[PDB]
Structures are given as C-alpha cells and as structure tokens.
Design an enzyme around this catalytic site. Structure first.
Site, PDB file in Angstrom:
ATOM      1  N   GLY A 100       0.782  -1.227   0.000  1.00 50.03           N
ATOM      2  CA  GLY A 100       0.000   0.000   0.000  1.00 50.03           C
ATOM      3  C   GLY A 100       0.818   1.284   0.000  1.00 50.03           C
ATOM      4  O   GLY A 100       0.263   2.387  -0.034  1.00 50.03           O
ATOM      5  N   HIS A 112       4.774   7.040   4.528  1.00 45.87           N
ATOM      6  CA  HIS A 112       4.066   7.956   5.420  1.00 45.87           C
ATOM      7  C   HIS A 112       4.987   8.551   6.472  1.00 45.87           C
ATOM      8  O   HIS A 112       4.813   9.692   6.900  1.00 45.87           O
ATOM      9  CB  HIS A 112       2.906   7.230   6.093  1.00 45.87           C
ATOM     10  CG  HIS A 112       1.803   6.874   5.148  1.00 45.87           C
ATOM     11  ND1 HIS A 112       1.238   5.618   5.101  1.00 45.87           N
ATOM     12  CD2 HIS A 112       1.183   7.601   4.186  1.00 45.87           C
ATOM     13  CE1 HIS A 112       0.319   5.587   4.151  1.00 45.87           C
ATOM     14  NE2 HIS A 112       0.266   6.776   3.582  1.00 45.87           N
ATOM     15  N   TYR A 120      -6.081  -2.027  -4.973  1.00 47.73           N
ATOM     16  CA  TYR A 120      -7.520  -1.860  -4.930  1.00 47.73           C
ATOM     17  C   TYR A 120      -7.979  -0.800  -5.914  1.00 47.73           C
ATOM     18  O   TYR A 120      -7.590   0.361  -5.801  1.00 47.73           O
ATOM     19  CB  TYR A 120      -7.949  -1.466  -3.519  1.00 47.73           C
ATOM     20  CG  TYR A 120      -7.525  -2.434  -2.433  1.00 47.73           C
ATOM     21  CD1 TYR A 120      -6.258  -2.355  -1.854  1.00 47.73           C
ATOM     22  CD2 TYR A 120      -8.400  -3.418  -1.967  1.00 47.73           C
ATOM     23  CE1 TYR A 120      -5.868  -3.234  -0.835  1.00 47.73           C
ATOM     24  CE2 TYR A 120      -8.021  -4.301  -0.948  1.00 47.73           C
ATOM     25  CZ  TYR A 120      -6.753  -4.203  -0.389  1.00 47.73           C
ATOM     26  OH  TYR A 120      -6.353  -5.080   0.600  1.00 47.73           O
TER      27      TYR A 120
END
Lengths: 292, 292, 292, 292
Positions: free
Chosen positions: B137, B142, B194
C-alpha cells in the site's frame, strides 16, 4: 496574501504513523487520567445496583459510555447493557475490554455502539425503549452551548429521553455548579463514583459572557508517579471544559425533555436532597421516571 | 506577553462529544477515501497468495494494517495473521470488521494490536519471528525524515526486519517516486491493490530541501457524488504527505536493515523488474528473505 | 463545535504593549539582519550613480524603499528622491533616519510614502512620471503568485512601469534563480549591493507545484555575536520566501509591462551580460528605457 | 512527528509586500476605531489643561502615546511634551501627524520615542524626571498578569513612577471595573476623553481564574458605514483584552509604586470622587504627587 502549509490535513490519518496530537504530553496524562477510572466507590456500586434492581429494570442504555467502567459493572451484574458514546477516542477502551472478555457470554452480548445525544434518535434503535438510561459522571456538562440559547441542550436531552420506555427510568447527573460558580473553585477529590488514586491540582477558570456564565474550564496539573528523577513523579497538565449547570436550570431542562409526563426527584450526593439542606452535595443526580 | 485560550487540550476527548477534528469536511472525505478504494485487484489477490503459498510461510505479520482490508484476506485465506498499525483512527476499522465477523473461527483468531515501527520490538512479541511480513500500500512512505538523515527510516526498517524469522520473508513497497519526482505529478487511479471507484483530482507539491527531495504532498479534491444540489457531486478536499523514496535509495536502505544477510528482489507492478525496463512500474515491491 | 479564544485579534494593537510577534526570537534576528544593510558595495555605488548621471535623470522613484539605504545615498547624492514601500515594518526605519537628518534641506525634501506595486497607480501621483524608478535588492521576488498564473506579477510590473516617464529608465533586478533552481541552493555571501558583515547559514527549500516551481524558501541561521556564553555568539533563525524568477520569464514579463514600447538590456552582476557567458551572475539587473 | 511549513517567520516583513496581518478585516476596523473616537471632549481639554496649569508643571511625559491625539494637544498648548509607547503600529500615527506639521516649531520640538513600561528606566532618560506624566485612556489596563501575581503591574508602575520628578505629578487612569465586573457588561459610548462617532456593539466576556477576576475581553462589532450594498453599513469585528482593575486594588498598587512617599487623589469621571458616591464614574483617574 500569506500562507502556512501544514503536512497533513486536520483529522486525517496515515497508517504507520500515530494520529495527530494522540501522543502529546497532555494526551498522555488525560489518558492515565481517564484511567484512574478503576477504584469505584462502594456507595456508588450499592446505590446504582440497588436502584436498578428496586425498579426491576433490566435493559440499560448508557449514553455516556466512555472507557466503559460504569457499563462493565452492569455487564457483570447481569443487565442487558448497550453502551454508546460520541468519542471514538474513549470508546476504543470499552471495546478493548470487551474483546478480552468476549469469551464470557455476558461480555459477548454487550453492545458498544457509537452515537451522539444530538443524533441519538437515528443512532440507536429504541423500539419499545429501554428500562433504564444512565448518563453519570457529570458527562452531560461536556456538551457546550455555542448559540447561547441552550438549543442543543434541549435536543441532547429531548433525544436521551426518547430512549426511555414508558415506565422507564432516567438517571442523569451533574456537578454542583451552583457551589463552584459561587466559590469559583472546583477542587479535586470530590468524585463520588470512582476514587482517583491520582494526586492532582486544578485551576478553575470561569467565563461569563454578558453576565451569563457560559463555561467552566479546568486546568489539571497531575503528579505522574515515576516520571521524575529518582522515584520522583512528573507534572504534566491537560485541559477540559464544561457548561456550568445550575440545579434549577437543569431540573426544568431535563423536565421539559419529557414534556412534563414525568416524575422528577433529585439526589444529594447519593442521599435524598431537600433545599436549604445543611449538606452541600458535590454532585446532583437526577432520577426521572417516564409516564408514557 | 500574549495568549490564546483553547477549550480542550490538543489530543484529549470528553465523553458525549465527538473527538477534536473527527468531523471536519476534510475528515469526511479522507474517510470515504481510506474506504473507497476497497475492491481488491485479482492480480493482487493472486500474486500475494501465490507467493505466500510458494514459499510456504503461514504465520504472517501486517505491520501496516490500516483499515485491515489486507489482513482480512489473509485471514479469510487461513493464514495465521496478526495485523498492527500506529494510527488508531485506522485500526478502529479493522476491529470494527473483526467484531462484525467474530463469529467466524479464523476471524476470532485474528490478532489486531497497536504498534509503531520505531518501537515494534517492544510492541509486538516475535520470539521466533514471523514467516512473512507484508507492508504493502506504500505505507512506509508515510513516515518522514525530520532530522534529514533518515535515521528513523533506518530504525523503522531495522525493527521491521527484526520481525522476520530466518528464512522468513519481507514484502515492503513504495510508489515509483523516481517517476513522480521527474514529472512532478502523482495522478490518481494507479492503485494496483484496490481499484478505487472514486473520482479524484490531485495537485502535487514537491519540496526539495537543499537539492534533496524531502517530501511529496498530495492535495486531493474528491468529487463526492450527490453531495451537491440535484444529485450533483460536491467537492471536498484533504491533504496527505509522503517521503519520496527513489529505487536505488530504498534498495540499499531496506537491505542494510538486514545487515546484508538477506536475499533481495524487486518487481514491477507485480511482474519482475529490471533497470531500463520498457514498462514503467506504478509501485516498487521489494521482497526480501532473511538468511539467519 | 470547538473553540480557541485568543486574547487579541490578529493585526490589532494596544498602547502600552508591544505589537504581536514584534519581539519574537525570529523578528529580533531579521531585524539585525535587515540592518546588516549598511556596508554598501563600491561597485554598487559607482554603478548606480554613474548610470543615474550618464542619462541625466534626477527625479528618482524607489518602489522598494525598505529601511531606506538605497534612497539615503540618492538623497545625499542630490537626486529628487521619493521612496515608497508596502511594509510599514520596514518604512519605519527610513522615516527614523529622515527625522534625524530633517535639519538637512535634502533629507527634509525627501519623500517617504507608503504604497503597493499593485495599487501604485492610485498610491503615488506620477503626473509627468519620474526620470528613474529603482527596485533593487531582489525585492520584486517577495511578491508571490497565489493564482499560479502570475496575474499579480504582470500588475505589479504594469504599475511600476506606468511610474516611468517617457524617456525615463527602469532599473529592476532579481537573483539568479536559474542557477539556484538548477543547483537547488542559495548560499549567503553573494549580495552585490551591501556586504553583510553577519555570518550566516542558509537551508534552501524549493517547492514545485505540478512540475512548475512556485516558491523558494530560505531558512537563515544567523550567528548573532555576543549572544553567547563568554563572548560566544548565539544562533537564532528566521524565514523568508521568494518566487523563483528565471531570466527568460522575467525578461519578457518586465517587457510586456511597457507593452513593447521599451528598450531592454540585462546586466550580469553589474557588468554586461551575454548568454553562454562564462561567468554565472549572482543577480540579474534589468535596465529598461520607456519610449513614450 | 508532524509539520506545518509557513511562508514567513512570525513578525518579519519583506519589502514590497504588506506586513503579516496588517490588512485583515479585523485590522481595518480596529484602524477606524483607534482613530474614530478623536473628537476631544471639552470637559477633557479644560480639565487636563487647567490641572496642568494649576500645578505649573511644563515638561510632560505621555507614557501611553498611542495615535498621539493626547500629546498633540499638550504640544499645541506649549507643553514640553515627550510621547512614548511600546506599540509601533500606534506610534506610526503620531509621527505621521508630527511630520505633517513638522513645519511648526512646537511640533518640531515634539519627541516621539518607543518604550515599554517594564523597561522605561533604560528606555527614556529622565535625569531630573518630568514635572507631569499622563497615562489616560485606560491604557494601563492593556498590560495583563500572566504570572497571576501582577508582578509586572508593579514593575510597570514602579518604572512609570520613577519618571516623576519630586513634587512631580502622575495622572494614570482606568475604567470603572468595579462596575463592569458586576454588570458583566462593558457597553460603548463611555469615553470621556473623545466622543466616538462610530456605531458599535460589544459582547463582554469576563474570565475569573480561581475566584479572581483575571481579564476582560471585548468583541466589538463595528457598523462600518457604506461598507454594504446601497450605502448600507457593513459589519466588521475585532477583539481586545484588558485587566480588570478594581478601585481599592489600583489605589494601593499605584501608591506602593511611590513607596508611600506620595499624595494620592482619585476623581470621578472628572469631578472629585468619594466612596458610595451617588454618581457612578465611567473612568477612575488617579492623580498622584511625588514628594521627593
């Protein structure tokens, strides 16, 4: 034309990294503060359970769940408990406890949902309503009155009452703000429900807008043990605010919530309270009774 | 000598009232973003499963849980999964689903904890270490580099690598930043995991501090359907920042997190990758292998 | 519903007390920074005066007054100087100097007004226009481009040009941003106009939005002498931003400002500049000449 | 680990561009407020002059200059005036007028410096000290008590008293706070010095910290004429805070600033004042007298 570009939008998260101010020196204390939760008062235990049983109500609704201590004792005590709260920061602690004790039938049938007293109506199916709804710990005082007309107060109240089955009971309290407003001080060590084993210091700030009191702010200076040099503790501080609710205002407020078709009664600290009473209560617990 | 009295400490909650920035118009979108991408990719399902099976590793660790949509599939697939994350605003969603399906043995056995890459050691007990460890992901991007020496990136990777059993696997990824750094753009509709079904717009802002790329900031303007007049969509926006990780950079970084005693591989979006490749990958997936 | 009541509104003052962030540790340095002003460069003195005289223009307009050092030398040198600036924080320093030397006929005839390049038109009576208008010190780079289309740039420029009498001259400069953008660094000690006797350190931050550079930010770490333990200096820091103006962009920008009826010419550091030039200028001084 | 990159340091300026919050819609009003009260009161003019003359003091010091409208009249009246203030956003206006009329000998001799009550000693040279020292307008109420022990109030008054020559006079004032503290309101149209001609509205907010009144905050909504559609007025608002000074309190405070060696008097709005008085003063003017 200026500017102040901030890294992450306010109120959004990223996996791998802690939520915004989640680990501030103030969030840390408040955490271990809302945790001093466990050391409940016998008086409190014996009063709620006895009141609960005395009227034979079994289906209880806690609209101020929080960490879930009030509700955990109800769950253990066998009532059909459904706990709800608007803070997902608090609720997280109830669910944690539940999961652990999910293996226990009771704890597994325990319902912890999320909801706001202002949307409660469309936040929790009432159906027949509940036998008893509790909102203790001076939690209704957290919701402020921006518009100054206490319109949201009447709504939060209106809604919470609609959760009460005809014949049902509403046990809602508030701190003795008449006293704190008069003296101008709200000192630590008065909580009747849970004995705080945490030494503290509190500076009370009272704000009045155009003569009408609007808010009471509490600056806490907690003595965190072990957070000191050689065994010594540390001193962090956090801040919370409440709406100074006067017994009189509240009594009628909570009452119009049922439209009058009610039965009001106000307890001193836990004992019956009659005006002029020699004893100054530190909390004001209102127990209502819906007619129909 | 000035002042700015604020109602509540930053990062603290009160029961009955929603959490600090939980309902900004920026949080509402970010909410339907961290959730409106979930329509897992067949290529993804098939690749991860297959590789997981191929090496026969069963006790998996998801150190970048998030809403849990990743783990939920390993769980569903019989893996001995334990999903972690640092952000509680995210986990709340993994535990919300788990509880939902707690009535499933696998799901019931699902471990969802809270942890930080920089503390993963004394946050999650390995003992023998897990067979596999995913971090897909582009979650690693981050965590930023304030110090400027990426000392934390290294701490994060060391910790995360330490969670791999010898002969164990690590699957950490990142976006092709060598590319967005050059085009200076990070457009939407590139998630290989996704397929979002959300119409988005993104303004890309790159900050180079002293000739060195230090951060990428994405301002997303989501076209929220119906949130307008006559069915018309509304336009809400949030912001998120990342660390531009270049391939060469990461390749040696994640490697030194194993002290060299590893087996490194890097694939295209999913297919294998070689420099100069004709096909431009949208994500760079490193799949390491601890020796001992 | 939240809150953060601040003592005084932003941008308002009260007598008896210092203006808001007027005495911050960052305002202090910037102060003694904009003060390193005095130690002007001979090259600068000999160039401006000679250029000024060589064309026999006497009525000068400084649209980037500031502390007023450029203008003070013009005042001493006998020109009819009218100084203007949009920052009342800066202007305050020019007026201070004037007052002192008000006893000097010249300084008394000195005009220090307030004005914005964007309202200049209706901020300063032009009449016949001025012989020469100067905007040196890389001051035009302070005005940012929010809308991204540099619409305010063309206006600031358009206006400043209208202040130029037909036959008048426009001496406007900018830093070599082509070089700083390319290298990604803007180091201290290049200012050609005034030798800074202040040791510094600068961290350059370059921001590009959708591939188009939009801003260059400078974080200064000044070594304040005497602000240390035993003779040692101190290290405070302040921050300023500029728009990275490329020679090419500017050349045409400044040109359309006159609508073409002009005479352009670009100086290297102070010397003539021809493309491919072996020497990389640290500043780019544009001297225009209005036709009519 | 977060971040919030801002364009310019707080409290720093750049030439060509307006100062930080200089043009907010809150500053615009505050501007036409600190200036739209000036229509001096005959009662004021006559009282101050007369008293100044009565005691025959000539070298006056205005330690709360502001826009200077006070000093400008002493100046006009031949007094040897020197006007000081801490806020530069305010003085800018006194020096703007002085310059305007610098062509007047008196005005030319007008000293307008910058100074802070807490530093007045080494800020303004007294030597012999001034004959008189005014601080009207309720300017002293601008300085707050963060520490909570008003140690600064005392520092301010000591310093300010030290500026009075033996046999010298001090004229410091404050609003009747004993009254607004009780009504909880501080309505407009009560300036006895200058009759504002501005239509205003004010919400009063009083903050009592631990039973002790600590600050008064005025949120003014000015009805700016014409700033609307068809001549209709616009409604802009700013905020300002003060320290609630009760009469008893101040009386002994300002006195200890003289070590007792003083002569204290206090009058009504202008007429003399006695406790229990029938007439309620809108301002309390203390007029002290240094012995030696």
């Amino acid at each position: 034309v200026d500017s102040v570009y901030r890294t992450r939008s306010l109120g959004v998260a990223a996996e791998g990294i802690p939520d915004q101010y989640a680990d501030g020196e103030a969030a840390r204390v408040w955490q271990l503060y809302i945790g001093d939760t466990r050391s409940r008062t016998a008086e409190y235990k014996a009063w709620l359970l006895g009141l609960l049983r005395q009227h034979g109500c079994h289906r209880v609704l806690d609209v101020a769940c929080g960490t879930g201590v009030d509700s955990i004792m109800l769950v253990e005590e066998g009532f059909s408990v459904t706990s709800v709260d608007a803070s997902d920061k608090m609720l997280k602690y109830a669910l944690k406890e539940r999961w652990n004790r999910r293996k226990e039938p009771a704890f597994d049938k325990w319902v912890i949902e999320e909801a706001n007293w202002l949307t409660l109506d469309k936040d929790v199916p009432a159906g027949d309503g509940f036998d008893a709804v509790i909102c203790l710990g001076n939690s209704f005082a957290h919701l402020p009155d921006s518009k100054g007309d206490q319109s949201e107060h009447r709504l939060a109240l209106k809604n919470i009452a609609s959760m009460v089955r005809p014949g049902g009971l509403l046990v809602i309290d508030h701190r003795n703000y008449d006293y704190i407003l008069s003296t101008g001080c709200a000192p630590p060590g008065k909580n009747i429900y849970y004995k705080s084993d945490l030494t503290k210091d509190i500076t009370t700030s009272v704000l009045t807008v155009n003569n009408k009191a609007h808010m009471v702010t509490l600056d806490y200076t907690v003595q965190v043990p072990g957070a000191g040099r050689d065994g010594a503790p540390g001193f962090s501080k956090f801040r919370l605010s409440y709406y100074p609710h006067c017994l009189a205002s509240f009594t009628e407020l909570v009452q119009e919530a049922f439209g009058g078709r009610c039965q009001h009664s106000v307890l001193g600290d836990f004992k019956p309270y009659r005006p002029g009473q020699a004893y100054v209560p530190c909390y004001f617990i209102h127990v209502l009774k819906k007619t129909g």
